């Protein structure tokens, strides 16, 4: 009864975005740039009332039963393909319609990937979408950046081998670190640093990429003494978590050490040892140990 009602409702919405996607794919894949322009104008989302469809799916995605219906009909892939094709068609634009459409799609994807092994793997297997998502981090819209960081945060958490490789390949590390440097809102920084913390533990390359970004290390040391206006330790914990993960690389690079030194990192880490947060204490111990130039006691804290 009501289940069929939910499925039909969700199905109609997905058929709508799919039909639009098929029109965009045909245009992008078969339309020869120079050939009777008037008979094949580039599709526009607004002309097909697409955002409203994505808005409904985004709202319904907060309800578990509707998420189940979406998962039975390949809803995540459909939404992802739409986000991807729109980004490829219009790139980075300051268009209010396009920004909202992408934010609604990203929010649905965050809801659909939350604690869903299958959906996370599926989204990461879509490398074109992944490149599109990462590109959105350069958007002037901080609300969009936050949505994308949240998607990347879910994907970087407990990622399988394939997902980890994709996340690295599309350059999400550099993109996230560069984004962290320009964000103005704390809520945004939290999602960005949280994602970077997950990513910084995947492999050595990710660690090297973080350190390579100009101003990154100085910025990370700065998060150690961050004064959260919302009275939280989230920034200090994630920023310090990232620092701990890349500290092993910093240890063998005098230039980087010099940067931590100039920013009085050591003194701050020693102060962190007194924290009421086990995460902060643990991060500090790990950083101090790595920088301090058989086994250590790190893996026991």
UniProtKB/Swiss-Prot annotation:
Q: Where in the cell is it found?
A: Cell junction, Adherens junction; Cytoplasm, Cytoskeleton; Cell projection, Lamellipodium; Cell projection, Ruffle membrane
- The lineage's top-level taxon is Eukaryota
Posttranslational mods: Phosphorylated; phosphorylation enhances the F-actin bundling activity. Phosphorylated by GSK3B. Ubiquitinated, leading to its degradation by the proteasome. Ubiquitination is facilitated by Axin. Deubiquitinated by ZRANB1/TRABID.
Expressed, tissue-wise, as follows: Expressed in a variety of tissues: brain, small intestine, colon, thymus, skeletal muscle, heart, prostate, lung, spleen, ovary, testis kidney, placenta, blood and liver. Isoform 1A: Very strongly expressed in brain but has relatively low expression levels in other tissues. Isoform 1B: Predominant form in all tissues except for brain, including gastric mucosa and blood.
Where is the signal peptide, in residue numbers? none
What does the record say mutating residue 18 to C does?
In FAP1; benign
Misc: APC mutations have led to some interesting observations. (1) the great majority of the mutations found to date would result in truncation of the APC product. (2) almost all the mutations have occurred within the first half of the coding sequence, and somatic mutations in colorectal tumors are further clustered in a particular region, called MCR (mutation cluster region). (3) most identified point mutations in the APC gene are transitions from cytosine to other nucleotides. (4) the location of germline mutations tends to correlate with the number of colorectal polyps in FAP1 patients.
Disease tied to this entry: Familial adenomatous polyposis 1: An autosomal dominant cancer predisposition syndrome characterized by adenomatous polyps of the colon and rectum, but also of upper gastrointestinal tract (ampullary, duodenal and gastric adenomas). This is a viciously premalignant disease with one or more polyps progressing through dysplasia to malignancy in untreated gene carriers with a median age at diagnosis of 40 years. Desmoid disease, hereditary: An autosomal dominant disease characterized by multifocal fibromatosis of the abdominal wall and mesentery. Desmoid tumors can also affect paraspinal muscles, breast, occiput, arms, and lower ribs.
Q: How does it assemble?
A: Forms homooligomers. Found in a complex consisting of ARHGEF4, APC and CTNNB1. Found in a complex composed of MACF1, APC, AXIN1, CTNNB1 and GSK3B. The complex composed, at least, of APC, CTNNB1 and GSK3B interacts with JPT1; the interaction requires the inactive form of GSK3B (phosphorylated at 'Ser-9'). Interacts with APC2. Interacts with DLG1 (via PDZ domains) and DLG3 (via PDZ domains). Interacts with alpha- and beta-catenins. Interacts with AXIN1 (via RGS domain). Interacts with ARHGEF4 (via N-terminus).
Function recorded in the entry: Tumor suppressor. Promotes rapid degradation of CTNNB1 and participates in Wnt signaling as a negative regulator. APC activity is correlated with its phosphorylation state. Activates the GEF activity of SPATA13 and ARHGEF4. Plays a role in hepatocyte growth factor (HGF)-induced cell migration. Required for MMP9 up-regulation via the JNK signaling pathway in colorectal tumor cells. Associates with both microtubules and actin filaments, components of the cytoskeleton. Plays a role in mediating the organization of F-actin into ordered bundles.
Domain-related comment: The microtubule tip localization signal (MtLS) motif; mediates interaction with MAPRE1 and targeting to the growing microtubule plus ends. The basic region (residues 2167-2674) mediates the association with both microtubule and actin proteins and promotes the bundling of F-actin.
Protein's UniProt name: Adenomatous polyposis coli protein
Give the organism the record lists: Homo sapiens (Human)
Range covered out of full length: 397 to 707 of 2843
